[PDB]
Amino acid sequence: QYDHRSRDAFWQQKWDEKRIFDWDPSSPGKKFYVLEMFPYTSGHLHIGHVRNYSMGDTLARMQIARGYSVLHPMGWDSFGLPAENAARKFGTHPAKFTQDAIDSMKRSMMQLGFGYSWANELATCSPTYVLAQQKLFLDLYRKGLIYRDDTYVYWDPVEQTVLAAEQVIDGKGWRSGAAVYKRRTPQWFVDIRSYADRLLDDLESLEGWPTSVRNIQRNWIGRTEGAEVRFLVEASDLTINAFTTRLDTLAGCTFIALAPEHTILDRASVKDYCESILVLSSEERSAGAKSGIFTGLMVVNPLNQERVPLYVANYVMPDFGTGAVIGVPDERDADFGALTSSAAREILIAHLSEKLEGQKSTQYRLQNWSISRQRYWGCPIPIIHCSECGTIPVAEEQLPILLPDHLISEGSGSPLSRDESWMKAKCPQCGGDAARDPDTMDTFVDSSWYFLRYPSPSSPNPIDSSLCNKIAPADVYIGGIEHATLHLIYSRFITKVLHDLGYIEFDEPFVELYNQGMVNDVHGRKQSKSLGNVTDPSVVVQEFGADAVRCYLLFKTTYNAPINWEDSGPQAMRSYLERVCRLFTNNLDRLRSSSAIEICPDDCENEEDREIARQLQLAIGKVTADVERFHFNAAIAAIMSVTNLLYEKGGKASPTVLAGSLRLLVRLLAPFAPHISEELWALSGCNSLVAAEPWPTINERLVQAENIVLPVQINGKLIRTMTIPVNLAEEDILSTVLALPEVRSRLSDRDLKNYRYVPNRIINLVVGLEH
RNA sequence: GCCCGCAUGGUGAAAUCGGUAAACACAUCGCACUAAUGCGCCGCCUCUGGCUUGCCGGUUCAAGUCCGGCUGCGGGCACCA
Ligand SMILES: CC(C)C[C@H](N)C(=O)NS(=O)(=O)OC[C@H]1O[C@@H](n2cnc3c(N)ncnc32)[C@H](O)[C@@H]1O
Ligand SMILES: [Mn+2]
Ligand SMILES: [Zn+2]
Structure with missing residues (x-):
């Protein structure tokens, strides 16, 4: 009998008009910043988002009731591959597709009663965001954190772009699922390697992150300890430093072998063999038979001071150490050759390091971050290339460099490179005719710092230091573990960079990270368009109302565990919510006779009142503590316990105790089922919005019964x-x-x-x- | 190979600190008012008693919880030198 199809909207408008969810930095309440991983604008809101975002709203509504000045914002991850591929697959320009998805997602969110501070909304594709990011890019470029280099990068032949190492998963491209290859090409990078030690060591301080996410990052960064031994070449100057952990076996080396891509290869079957390995996909390059080619030349072991054969082999992987190995039949080297140690390592490196012929070596698996993409739908790189002067920053006056409105979908090079009038630019140094950078920034650049932009999302400065240093670091960040070595690495990296450069005074973006569980279909399969099992949240909200949908997701299981979604699954919560309503409508005489919003000691005329009063106080304490540690399902069970209590013992209770209990019940329920709660609050005769009522506190006189x-x-x-x-x-x-x-x-x-x-x-x- | 997480009834699960294991729901069954609603049973056994949080131990007055070792599942990095 609660008419959610008109009443949800009615209450949503009441909350809007009171400005309950508008973040005010000049509020005196203690600050609290809760956010969730902002969505790609690749389609409509899906049920998984609803789970992810419900948790943030529940927490935020409670923290607001508790007097905190809460920033709970939302905006749109709207550039790069996800929006762009979805727009291509549909047949519309990605600007138009993105805006439609924004508008659809924002509407779905509002209809769910999600209480975002919409004055703080942003979209990474808007000119205002582009201006900010281009400024940040040019700052990092001036300070040497961003640089251009002509080296090996991952290439996705189906996306037709370069990808970052983090966007290669199981040898495949992040979105395409296609085998990735490696090309040498001039590209833009950020020097994340120089921060790798701080990224690795500062994990120990992130006690609010799951140990699983932390350990996944530890293995991604992958710091290794060993030794570099320098090997001189006969009729030559420069050496080739090999890398090993078993330095102990140095005199035992029968040979040296190189990676096909190593700088120093400075002829018939060499350049033929190498280009035959270098042509292989990253997958193929790791598997199959072992191969190689004798260089011809030879090279020296400076302990033994004695000559050794040099080779070029496929089983030397280019992303580990120096790309030179130092072989002993270590049964890698045993299959190749057929074609008492610790304090020994101590004294060996002493001899080598003191006579400049070796040293202690720290190596990292982490590759520097490729950010340039040969794609239309991303943030332009605010660089001009001049045949005279080289790479030149666009002048601040010219910012932002916006995309041209028309996209050219066939031709050579990158999509922007095909647009001759967009590409034409004056060199800002000499004034000659020059060319814009033809590439765009990867989507993970946008999302690496967006949380620092929400506090003033239309400012001509990228980040408002004085607001940010008060509202951030974010207290609570809610999103999927799939980002463990994508956005959760990059965001930590860019926070440290911006800290060191003065934008902010904190070194870690997110205090507490919570990873919501997967929402799957009824049979436990990932939801996807290809299986035709994508839940439409609007259909479910229309049938059951927002509250029942949100409470089913929150009550079904632990926050971090999977849900197998059933469209009829909210029916049982809806039934629980109607049973709450009926407890109000049964007791409406009593409600309209007492103004009580909680239980006072003087209201209790006996032992039964005191059993009730006590149970409520425990429920206040438990709901409070459980919301703040994401035990939503246990909090909701506590409210259902109270509800059962009142069915069973209410009516024997003194009227005032019962009116107070019922009003207290709806106060605790509000964060979970906010619309129905306003309805019942109002039905009971209150004039205020429960959402604006101070959160209940334990009355310590009522906590022990007799x-x-x-x-x-x-x-x-x-x-x-x-x-x-x-x-x-x-x-x-x-x-x-x-x-x-x-x-x-x-x-x-x-x-x-x-x-x-x-x-x-x-x-x-x-x-x-x-x- | 190297690193990490997890394990509780038919089912989803609960249990700040070590303190009555299974709260709260879902399913089936039963009861009361002719579907709705209210309400009840609902881990096991050789059942006056006695067990039970995958297995074996340790710590402690006290272990689902802490420590050690297994087994099983999940996840992460790797022709990783
Ligand atoms: C910060 C930025 C790099 C994020 C990036 N723009 C992004 O990932 N966008 S997004 O739309 O794919 O995801 C948004 C949030 O929604 C969660 N989610 C998605 N599906 C499900 C699901 N089936 N079940 C549970 N959660 C789901 C997901 O994990 C994430 O936290
Ligand atoms: Mn293995
Ligand atoms: Zn010039």
């Missing part, structure tokens, strides 16, 4: 329980316990040695052996 159920152990084993008055003297407790028949029986041939009494919790009697 009697306590105390379990009794003997030697740690539960025997029975005993009900006693609260504040019984410890000697009277013991004397009462020793009098229980079960206890008198079990001690009739045994001596009492000790007891452990934990007040109002337990008594364990420590007893000797059978006489």
